[PDB]
Amino acid sequence: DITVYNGQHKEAATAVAKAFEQETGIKVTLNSGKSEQLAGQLKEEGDKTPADVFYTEQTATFADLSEAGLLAPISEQTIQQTAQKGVPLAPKKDWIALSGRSRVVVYDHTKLSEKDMEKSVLDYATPKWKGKIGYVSTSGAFLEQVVALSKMKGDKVALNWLKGLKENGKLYAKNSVALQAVENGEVPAALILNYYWYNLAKEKGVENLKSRLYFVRHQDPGALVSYSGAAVLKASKNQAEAQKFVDFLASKKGQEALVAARAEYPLRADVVSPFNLEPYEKLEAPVVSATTAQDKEHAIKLIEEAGL
Numbered sequence: 001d002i003t004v005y006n007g008q009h010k011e012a013a014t015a016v017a018k019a020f021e022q023e024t025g026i027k028v029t030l031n032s033g034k035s036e037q038l039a040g041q042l043k044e045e046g047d048k049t050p051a052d053v054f055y056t057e058q059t060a061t062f063a064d065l066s067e068a069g070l071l072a073p074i075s076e077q078t079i080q081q082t083a084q085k086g087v088p089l090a091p092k093k094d095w096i097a098l099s100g101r102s103r104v105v106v107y108d109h110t111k112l113s114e115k116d117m118e119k120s121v122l123d124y125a126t127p128k129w130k131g132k133i134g135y136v137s138t139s140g141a142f143l144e145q146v147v148a149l150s151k152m153k154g155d156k157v158a159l160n161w162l163k164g165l166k167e168n169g170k171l172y173a174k175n176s177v178a179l180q181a182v183e184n185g186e187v188p189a190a191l192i193l194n195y196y197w198y199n200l201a202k203e204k205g206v207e208n209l210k211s212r213l214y215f216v217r218h219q220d221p222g223a224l225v226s227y228s229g230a231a232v233l234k235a236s237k238n239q240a241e242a243q244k245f246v247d248f249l250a251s252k253k254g255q256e257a258l259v260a261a262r263a264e265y266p267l268r269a270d271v272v273s274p275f276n277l278e279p280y281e282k283l284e285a286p287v288v289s290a291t292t293a294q295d296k297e298h299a300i301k302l303i304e305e306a307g308l
């Protein structure tokens, strides 16, 4: 039986954990928490941790754990299962990316069309969009978006974007509220995460929604994908079962269980989402280094300096 420290959404974790038990007979116990809290706890526990596997919504928490020497190598065969072009790869082969979530632009298709849309996320934070673009400054995904912009285009561009959103954007408390405002006719478009919209569409039928999705693509900062993944703890006294769980997550069946429970992009090339997501490769996600905590603190300074 194994212990999984779980930073991912509980419906995702529960659903892969149950398909695991069904396929192998091995019981999974989840210890859930925020990924950053869990990584800290895994570093304090060190070689005395009870964790066998760390399952996270964000692969960036792996870099420090790897560098601290706390992750076990994963099979090369397993790593190759999700190693599409653009997918982050552990240089020490000691964690694996499993699924992604994308930034998108949701729009009311009865007020705007694909041809009104912009080639860059940078273009939405300008006067042509005054009163017409929703954003959510308090979101974890928003913070990540800032970091990527800072890294790809430098700090002056990121700050200019944030100032533009302040001047021109409609601020919403959460991604789901932003979507509702677009559906309700309050704002014709917003910046959100893909899965809020696919969830609504799965539930309602696309033909009954005013809103549609525009993906920026061509490796723009607004095509940013954030990746979930897993690692085996080097200190686990149950390596065999831990490695079997991680291989299962990379397997066709494990990936099929994830995408049944949650509208993330599978990273296996032979699995299709029941939410009707495009193939990962069509996203043309940019290549961006991992978000450190210093990166997150930096983005918060830019958000503050912008009056947000």
Ligand SMILES: [Fe+3]
Binding pocket: 175
């Ligand atoms: Fe959320």
